[PDB]
Amino acid sequence: AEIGGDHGYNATNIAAGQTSGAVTQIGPAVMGMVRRAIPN
Amino acid sequence: SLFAPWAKMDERNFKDQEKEDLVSITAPKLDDGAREFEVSSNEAASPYNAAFQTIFGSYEPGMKTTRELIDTYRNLMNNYEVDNAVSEIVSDAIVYEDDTEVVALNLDKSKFSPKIKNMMLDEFS
């Protein structure tokens, strides 16, 4: 009755792909990035 | 947006290249041409940082290369026995005579139809 368990909403752990279940992840699927823009 | 109607085709052309399989090329597709500007795609993560450095990096020389050369070329041409070279070349290159031909389109290869040839010739004129 293996589960993937879950994360604690603790970014520290999430960032490492760490869950409470049978498996862990590689990391949290990076979604790209946002840089602040330059003014006119 | 003054040339937006032109841009419509240019955007298409660019996209046709994006949709093309001319990939896995280490070499630039640059034979003889324009100043090279390089950015990532990456959902436009930083084209603007590169653009500003490129713009001001270009501002530094201030196109002095082109600027000095054109001014130089003119200053050269402005001299005696220099214009003669230029003018003779131009004269030999572009020839006019009494009621004669000038550069002209010559459709001597297979064409879709004579009608198109006529259309092209009218456009050339």
From Swiss-Prot, chain A:
It comes from the Viruses. A proteolytic cleavage by the prohead core protein protease gives rise to the mature major capsid protein during virus maturation. Homohexamer. Interacts with the portal protein. Interacts with the capsid vertex protein that forms pentamers. Interacts with hoc; one hoc molecule associates with each capsid hexamer. Interacts with soc; this interaction reinforces the capsid structure. A total of 960 subunits of the major capsid protein forms the 160 hexamers. Belongs to the Tevenvirinae major capsid protein family. Major capsid protein that self-associates to form hexamers, building most of the capsid in association with pentons made of the capsid vertex protein and one dodecamer of the portal protein. The major capsid protein self-associates to form 160 hexamers, building most of the T=13 laevo capsid. Folding of major capsid protein requires the assistance of two chaperones, the host chaperone groL acting with the phage encoded gp23-specific chaperone, gp31. The capsid also contains two nonessential outer capsid proteins, Hoc and Soc, which decorate the capsid surface. This is Major capsid protein. The lineage of its organism: Viruses, Duplodnaviria, Heunggongvirae, Uroviricota, Caudoviricetes. The chain holds residues 66 to 105 of 521 of the full protein.
Swiss-Prot record, chain B:
It comes from the Viruses. It is found in: Virion; Host cell inner membrane. Forms the portal vertex of the capsid. This portal plays critical roles in head assembly, genome packaging, neck/tail attachment, and genome ejection. The portal protein multimerizes as a single ring-shaped homododecamer arranged around a central channel. Binds to the terminase subunits to form the packaging machine. Attaches to the host inner membrane most likely through interaction with host yidC and forms together with chaperone gp40 an initiator complex to form the prohead. Homododecamer. Interacts with the large terminase subunit. Interacts with the major capsid protein. Interacts with the capsid vertex protein. Belongs to the Tevenvirinae portal protein family. This is Portal protein. It comes from Enterobacteria phage T4. The lineage of its organism: Viruses, Duplodnaviria, Heunggongvirae, Uroviricota, Caudoviricetes. The chain holds residues 7 to 131 of 524 of the full protein.
